[PDB]
Design a protein around this ligand. Sequence first.
Ligand SMILES: COc1cc(Nc2cc(-n3c(C)cc4c3CC(C)(C)CC4=O)ccc2C(N)=O)cc(OC)c1OC
Length: 209
Amino acid sequence: EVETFAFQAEIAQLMSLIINTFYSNKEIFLRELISNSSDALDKIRYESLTDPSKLDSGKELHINLIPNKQDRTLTIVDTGIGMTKADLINNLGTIAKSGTKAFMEALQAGADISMIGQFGVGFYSAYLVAEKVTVITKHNDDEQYAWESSAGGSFTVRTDTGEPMGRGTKVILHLKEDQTEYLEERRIKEIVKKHSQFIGYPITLFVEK
Ligand SMILES: COc1cc(Nc2cc(-n3c(C)cc4c3CC(C)(C)CC4=O)ccc2C(N)=O)cc(OC)c1OC
């Protein structure tokens, strides 16, 4: 069973701006998604200090970047806190609404899209490079879910029947036809070094084939 939901107006607006605005510095999407992963990893790590059993679903705290040229996808995988159904549908969206408002005000005042992260809505920078984003996530004490959106004002959530993840999140970027450079090892290495060099978790760039 697949449930379909409408984005709140502000998020739909944000996604349209990201998709429609001419802005060449698209590579910033990667640091934003890695920053989401890092924050998620911080969260499970801190929680585990008071409840060590929260790591029964996996001790290792890390990030993998997986390019797939056949599928034309770049996947960002982490073993962070993951997201409940409520996190996916309601709660992160509520925070993103107020973040969007501040971001759009800042843009009018002369800020640029690369500053999106300061407003807590950096996830949506995925749409600079992706025609569709799929999010597979597993939080402790909840089911594995798949969230998906190609924008257009709606997203879906279903319970996932793919490979079980233990705990964490996979963000699968179905890349735009003209954005396949982000499948190249050298290009990913370049971006991580430039923007994500001090992330406090191992980042493994998988190689193709
Ligand atoms: C930044 O803080 C947090 C991030 C996350 N996780 C994440 C959240 C997002 N994220 C954020 C910040 C906003 C949004 C998302 C993903 C979405 C599909 C729910 C759409 C959205 O509006 C993306 C990736 C992860 C990830 N890699 O785990 C979970 C949290 O707690 C369950 C949390 O603490 C509030």
